[PDB]
Structure 1
Amino acid sequence: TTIVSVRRNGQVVVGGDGQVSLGNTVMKGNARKVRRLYNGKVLAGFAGGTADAFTLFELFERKLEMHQGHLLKSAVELAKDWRTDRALRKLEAMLIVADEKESLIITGIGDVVQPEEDQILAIGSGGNYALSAARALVENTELSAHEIVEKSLRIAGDICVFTNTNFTIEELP
């Protein structure tokens, strides 16, 4: 898939395509790869293998529930359930999570990663495509977060054979 997030002007947007691909065939095209958590106050988009992607998401959620939705602490708490003696079980999936305050990228072997200065994050086979297009627009236009997301997503669905154009975009007032 291609999941990208841009944060600009007190706006945070996370968007992604909807192509569930099994092998070199396509099973579903209208998949929702970005969803809202903790009383819609936090966005989550996921790449990787379906199931794991889902378990990795449902996991972050229970954490969010136990920590008053503190995006940053929940991420770390969750990471710490892999970074210990008794492994949790490696999940082949990544999440891009974001709330009003932070944008974070969490992986299935436990390690939270912050964005670079530009505050842009993208994951998925077509991630770098969207990332490149996004960095370009953020550095060279006044386009809103939403527009850049929408725009980069397409530029990427056009290069990646695993990313389609049916988008699901969510922004955070």
Structure 2
Amino acid sequence: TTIYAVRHNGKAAMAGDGQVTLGQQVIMKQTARKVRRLYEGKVLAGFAGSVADAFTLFEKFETKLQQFSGNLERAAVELAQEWRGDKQLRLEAMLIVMDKDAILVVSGTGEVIAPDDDLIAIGSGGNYALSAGRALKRHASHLSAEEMAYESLKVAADICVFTNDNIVVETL
């Protein structure tokens, strides 16, 4: 799994692959959709874990956003301390959220991280898309956010055994 988000030239994008793996060994699905639209379509979210846990956190993050009038950082922080508060969800998959202004990553370890260069990724191949995204932002700034997100996922897909090239890109 790899989910990469990038704000570039007033355009925001988030791309994800489609592979689902069981027991770190077998492929069970190739066409999964891991990028979801939240909060009246003003937030692009993604989760590197299971769909049951993803939907549970997506729901709790939506009520936090409605509680704080779309304050992405404050909603993420209280979700993180609520997430760590739960017996069951306290899980090493990470959450990535993004509105028109900020990007954030929320981990089960309670870390809330905003990227320094408006680009970040999660999943088993996230550091590979992050590596390609940074080279693209510096040496290929003529690419759009959607193009950057797609090429970074494609780079990580050829490296990560748990990330395929069935890449879907969502724009805000």
Q: Same fold (TM over 0.5)?
A: yes
Quote the Cα distance in structure 2 between the aligned partners of 1:55 and 1:28. 21
Equivalence for 2:49: 48
Equivalence for 2:19: 19
Deviation at 1:148, TM superposition (A): 0.9
Q: Please list every run of at least 4 consecutive aligned residues from structure 1 whose deviation after the TM superposition is greater than 4 angstroms.
A: none
User: Deviations for 1:108-164, whole angstroms, at most 9, x for unmatched residues?
Assistant: 243311112x11101111111101111000010121111111011111111111111
Going from structure 1 to structure 2, the CA distance change for 1:156 and 1:82 (only over 3 Å counts) comes to: closer
1:88 to 83, 86, 89: 86
Quote the Cα distance in structure 2 between the aligned partners of 1:53 and 1:82. 12
SS of the aligned residue for 1:80 comes to helix
Q: Which residues of 2 match residues 1-173 of structure 1 at below 5 A? A: 1-23=1-23, 24-82=25-83, 87-89=85-87, 90-116=90-116, 118-141=117-140, 142-172=142-172
Quote the Cα distance in structure 2 between the aligned partners of 1:45 and 1:6. 13
TM-score, normalised relative to structure 1? 0.89
Residues 81, 110 of structure 1: 8 Å contact kept = no
Task: State the identity %.
Answer: 60
SS of the aligned residue for 1:123 comes to strand
TM-score, normalised relative to structure 2? 0.90
Going from structure 1 to structure 2, the CA distance change for 1:45 and 1:170 (only over 3 Å counts) comes to: same
Going from structure 1 to structure 2, the CA distance change for 1:88 and 1:76 (only over 3 Å counts) comes to: same
Runs of at least 5 residues in structure 1 that lack an aligned partner in the other structure: none
Quote the Cα distance in structure 2 between the aligned partners of 1:109 and 1:52. 15
Deviation at 1:8, TM superposition (A): 0.7
Going from structure 1 to structure 2, the CA distance change for 1:134 and 1:8 (only over 3 Å counts) comes to: same
Alignment root-mean-square deviation, CA = 1.6
Deviation at 1:82, TM superposition (A): 5.0
User: Deviations for 1:75-117, whole angstroms, at most 9, x for unmatched residues?
Assistant: 122223256xxx323033211100011111112243311112x
Residues 79, 111 of structure 1: 8 Å contact kept = yes
Count of residue pairs the alignment pairs up: 168
Deviation at 1:50, TM superposition (A): 4.0
Runs of at least 5 residues in structure 2 that lack an aligned partner in the other structure: none
